[PDB]
C-alpha cells in the first residue's frame, strides 16, 4: 500500500494527492445514546461532503477538474511552489478566506453546464 490513513499529512501535496482512497474508506443508557449520537453525526458530515460533490458534478470523483479559472486574488503562487512544497494543511489555511467563495463558483459552473447540456441534446 502507501503510508496509510492520513500518513501524508505533513507530506508534499504532490505525493499526498496519490492514494486518496485511504482516507475515503475510514470516513464512514449513557453509552448507547452517546454512541448512537456519534453514528448519526458521522452520516451527516459525510453526506454534506457527497452533497457538495453532487452539486459540483463531481459525485463519484476523488480528483475532479472544473471550469472556474484560478483567480490569483486567492493565491499568486506557482503550481510548483504548491504541489512540491506546501502540505495540504498549509495550503487550505491560505485559501481559508476564499474557500466559501470558490464553493459558490463551482455550483454555478455545474448549473450552467447542465443548462447548456440540456440545449445540446435538444438536437
Amino acid at each position, epitope marked *: 500500500f502507501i503510508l496509510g490513513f492520513l500518513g501524508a499529512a505533513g507530506s*508534499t501535496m*504532490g*505525493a499526498a494527492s496519490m492514494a486518496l482512497t485511504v482516507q475515503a474508506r475510514l470516513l464512514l443508557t449513557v453509552w448507547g445514546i452517546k454512541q448512537l449520537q456519534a453514528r448519526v453525526l458521522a452520516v451527516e458530515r459525510y453526506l454534506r461532503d457527497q452533497q457538495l460533490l453532487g452539486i459540483w458534478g463531481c459525485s463519484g470523483k476523488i480528483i475532479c477538474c472544473t471550469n472556474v479559472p484560478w483567480n490569483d486574488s486567492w493565491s499568486n503562487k506557482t503550481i*510548483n*511552489e504548491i*504541489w*512540491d*512544497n506546501m502540505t495540504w494543511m*498549509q495550503w487550505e489555511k491560505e485559501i481559508d478566506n476564499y474557500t466559501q467563495h470558490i464553493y459558490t463558483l463551482l455550483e454555478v459552473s455545474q448549473i450552467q453546464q447542465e443548462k447548456n447540456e440540456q440545449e445540446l441534446l435538444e438536437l
Partner: nanobody
Amino acid sequence: QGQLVQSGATTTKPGSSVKISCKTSGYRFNFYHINWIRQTAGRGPEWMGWISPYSGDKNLAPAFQDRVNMTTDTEVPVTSFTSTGAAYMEIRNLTSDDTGTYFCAKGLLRDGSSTWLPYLWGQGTLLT
C-alpha cells in the same frame, strides 16, 4: 523565509581545521536540504555539498569528499511549521588556497527536480 545565521570570521593556519556553524529559524529545518558554498580568491564560486536535516543524507562534490566533516543538529520545534536547527561544516587538510567566504544555503523545495537548489543563503564567514 527564515534566517540562516552562521559563525564569525575565524582564521587559522594551514593543516588545521575550522568549524563553521549555521543556525536556522523561521522555517521547518527538516523539510529542506542544507548546502555549503564558498568563493575563494583564486577561483570563482564552488559547490561543496548538501546534507538532509531529515534523511541524514550527504552528497558532496568529489573535489571536497575526503576533506569535509558535515553534520546537523535536530530542529527544536517552535510552531507546527517553524523550527530552529543548526548545520556544521569542518574541513581536513586546510591550506591558504581554501581562503575565502563561506555560507550555508537552505534548499529550494521539498519535491520535484529542483529540491536541493541552494535558495536561501546565510550571511558569510571569512576563513584563513
